[PDB]
């Protein structure tokens, strides 16, 4: 649900959003869409501050649900002890 | 005793949740507080959604499912003691109390090597009853619940 189903449309980006800002929305939308289905969980200058506010909160929450409900880190260490 | 339908079931609905529905209901019809109204608000809420989102349809079903299952386990073990009943099945079905059978075999032996007739069905229920008393097992409970059968004439 990460590699596909999301495409940055180069044609319909408004001029008043820089090409880098358009990759922070495609990443906040994907971070919430993936948090619901697969993870199985449910919950200008002020404009630039809104994107970053929606970034430094959603992503920081995605790791918490991915380290407490699934222990993503505890598998990396365990996948070195045995498989390596 | 209800069933499920597949030839009429919707397309986008998976069979997994369909099975979940079939169990959460039959567990009520057979079974004849706050866990009743709150869910009604949840179901009504979905009726307001202008787009059917399966990813949410399950988060309300599974909670309802886990609540009745948690409520049913409370009765199937604590109130209606399953351990005692399983302890009965292991003893008699699976020959757990083998000491009862070596005496029953010792007595009800000649009356079974002959081919079976219409009378042998009662000729053993007594011998089995003579057995439980022969091993000083005195319990009017669970004693008449055990009835040996004779598959005769077919």
XYZ file of C-alpha atoms in Angstrom:
238
model
C 0.000 0.000 0.000
C 3.149 2.173 -0.163
C 4.878 1.440 -3.456
C 1.718 1.758 -5.604
C -1.856 3.302 -5.612
C -0.418 6.861 -5.136
C 0.933 8.969 -8.057
C 2.112 12.633 -7.965
C 0.317 14.151 -10.975
C 2.865 16.485 -12.542
C 0.160 18.208 -14.590
C -2.423 19.305 -12.009
C -0.106 20.916 -9.450
C -1.056 24.567 -8.851
C 1.674 27.086 -9.536
C 1.405 28.517 -6.021
C 2.698 25.272 -4.474
C 6.374 24.453 -4.886
C 7.255 21.010 -6.212
C 8.641 19.993 -2.817
C 5.477 20.975 -0.945
C 3.537 18.654 -3.246
C 5.528 15.676 -1.925
C 4.684 16.447 1.695
C 0.938 16.208 1.088
C 1.222 12.945 -0.931
C 3.146 11.690 2.098
C 0.704 12.899 4.752
C -2.259 11.507 2.844
C -0.498 8.154 2.323
C 0.533 8.096 6.008
C -3.095 8.325 7.147
C -4.656 6.129 4.431
C -2.139 3.383 5.314
C -2.672 3.915 9.042
C -6.348 2.936 8.669
C -6.449 -0.033 6.302
C -3.294 -2.073 6.865
C -2.260 -0.978 10.355
C -5.919 -1.467 11.417
C -6.333 1.660 13.525
C -8.713 4.620 13.557
C -8.500 8.023 15.224
C 1.314 32.271 2.431
C 3.317 31.446 5.550
C 0.611 30.047 7.828
C -0.121 27.588 5.012
C 3.437 26.240 5.034
C 3.191 25.906 8.807
C 0.043 23.820 8.423
C 1.727 21.220 6.204
C 4.622 20.824 8.634
C 2.248 20.684 11.598
C 0.372 17.865 9.871
C 3.724 16.179 9.180
C 5.544 16.273 12.523
C 2.454 14.786 14.176
C 1.099 12.138 11.803
C 4.454 10.524 11.040
C 5.578 10.638 14.672
C 2.351 8.800 15.498
C 2.822 6.246 12.710
C 6.025 4.985 14.340
C 4.417 4.712 17.777
C 1.648 2.460 16.482
C 4.271 0.568 14.466
C 6.593 -0.009 17.443
C 4.060 -0.778 20.206
C 1.434 -2.737 18.266
C 3.913 -4.523 15.987
C 7.424 -3.946 17.425
C 9.072 -3.151 14.105
C 12.400 -2.559 15.847
C 12.315 -5.749 17.930
C 12.219 -7.709 14.666
C 15.230 -5.978 13.102
C 17.365 -6.992 16.083
C 15.876 -10.485 16.152
C 16.375 -10.844 12.389
C 20.108 -10.253 12.916
C 20.568 -12.741 15.748
C 19.144 -15.689 13.786
C 19.061 -14.925 10.061
C 22.524 -13.296 10.182
C -30.352 -23.225 13.740
C -29.683 -20.593 11.076
C -27.357 -20.616 8.085
C -25.603 -18.242 5.695
C -26.254 -17.276 2.079
C -23.608 -16.838 -0.598
C -25.605 -16.700 -3.856
C -27.136 -13.383 -2.733
C -24.311 -11.966 -0.635
C -22.892 -8.616 -1.834
C -19.695 -8.394 -3.849
C -17.465 -5.953 -1.961
C -18.330 -7.581 1.385
C -15.797 -10.306 2.260
C -16.913 -13.662 3.583
C -14.742 -13.194 6.688
C -17.016 -10.521 8.143
C -20.041 -12.458 6.874
C -19.005 -15.334 9.132
C -18.522 -12.839 11.960
C -22.106 -11.654 11.543
C -23.545 -15.174 11.489
C -21.928 -15.951 14.844
C -22.673 -12.722 16.715
C -26.388 -13.138 16.076
C -26.943 -16.841 16.650
C -25.142 -16.320 19.957
C -28.102 -14.096 20.908
C -31.075 -16.004 19.494
C -29.808 -19.070 21.341
C -28.986 -17.011 24.436
C -32.659 -15.894 24.637
C -27.142 -2.521 29.921
C -24.693 -0.152 28.231
C -23.563 -2.725 25.638
C -26.880 -2.299 23.788
C -27.562 1.387 23.127
C -24.003 2.543 22.401
C -23.709 0.182 19.436
C -27.036 1.462 18.112
C -25.421 4.895 17.939
C -22.479 3.365 16.070
C -24.670 1.648 13.472
C -26.777 4.781 13.042
C -23.565 6.772 12.570
C -22.586 4.641 9.576
C -25.963 5.420 8.017
C -24.896 9.079 7.881
C -21.650 8.343 6.032
C -22.028 9.318 2.345
C -19.504 6.636 1.319
C -19.394 2.980 2.364
C -15.927 2.402 3.842
C -15.251 -1.277 4.506
C -12.129 -0.348 6.489
C -14.509 1.103 9.094
C -17.307 -1.460 8.739
C -15.049 -3.983 10.464
C -13.983 -1.761 13.377
C -17.593 -1.721 14.624
C -18.332 -5.371 13.883
C -15.186 -6.735 15.504
C -15.761 -4.782 18.714
C -19.333 -6.071 18.898
C -17.981 -9.532 18.090
C -15.280 -9.427 20.757
C -17.720 -8.135 23.379
C -20.303 -10.898 22.988
C -17.500 -13.454 22.723
C -16.003 -12.097 25.943
C -19.479 -12.214 27.474
C -20.080 -15.754 26.229
C -16.754 -17.108 27.495
C -17.689 -15.751 30.923
C -20.700 -18.075 30.963
C -19.274 -21.057 29.065
C -16.518 -21.519 31.684
C -17.351 -19.738 34.937
C -21.125 -20.079 35.319
C -21.580 -23.224 33.212
C -18.416 -25.081 34.231
C -16.848 -26.624 31.140
C -13.847 -28.082 32.986
C -16.071 -30.367 35.037
C -17.895 -31.482 31.900
C -14.718 -32.096 29.905
C -13.449 -34.051 32.906
C -16.498 -36.289 32.485
C -15.927 -36.821 28.764
C -12.252 -37.736 29.141
C -13.094 -40.337 31.790
C -15.908 -42.252 30.088
C -15.616 -41.563 26.350
C -11.824 -41.723 26.105
C -11.568 -44.561 28.660
C -10.069 -42.175 31.202
C -11.589 -44.253 34.000
C -10.341 -47.544 32.625
C -10.788 -49.238 36.000
C -14.561 -49.051 35.493
C -14.391 -50.803 32.132
C -12.221 -53.789 33.060
C -14.966 -54.786 35.490
C -17.741 -54.042 33.003
C -15.900 -56.148 30.435
C -15.434 -58.824 33.097
C -19.204 -59.045 33.633
C -20.799 -58.131 30.288
C -18.732 -60.518 28.182
C -20.796 -63.607 27.339
C -23.758 -61.412 26.383
C -21.931 -59.748 23.473
C -19.968 -62.430 21.597
C -23.328 -63.736 20.428
C -24.890 -61.735 17.587
C -27.013 -58.832 18.804
C -30.770 -59.079 19.207
C -33.568 -56.736 20.272
C -33.054 -57.497 23.981
C -29.296 -56.984 24.467
C -29.706 -53.195 24.658
C -31.129 -53.431 28.179
C -28.988 -56.438 29.133
C -25.928 -54.149 29.267
C -27.283 -50.908 30.739
C -27.895 -52.885 33.920
C -24.434 -54.481 33.834
C -22.894 -51.043 33.375
C -24.984 -49.878 36.326
C -23.800 -52.880 38.336
C -20.285 -51.733 37.427
C -20.302 -48.150 38.715
C -21.507 -49.442 42.073
C -18.909 -52.221 41.908
C -16.181 -49.542 41.922
C -17.878 -47.732 44.840
C -18.729 -44.837 42.511
C -21.986 -43.600 44.053
C -23.374 -40.558 42.256
C -26.956 -40.237 41.050
C -25.684 -37.304 39.000
C -24.151 -38.091 35.581
C -25.036 -41.762 36.106
C -28.350 -41.828 34.168
C -26.892 -39.477 31.559
C -24.697 -42.325 30.265
C -26.711 -44.687 28.059
C -24.947 -47.339 26.002
C -26.372 -47.833 22.518
C -26.637 -51.000 20.435
C -26.594 -50.444 16.688
C -28.973 -53.289 15.826
C -30.631 -54.091 12.485
C -28.664 -51.634 10.375
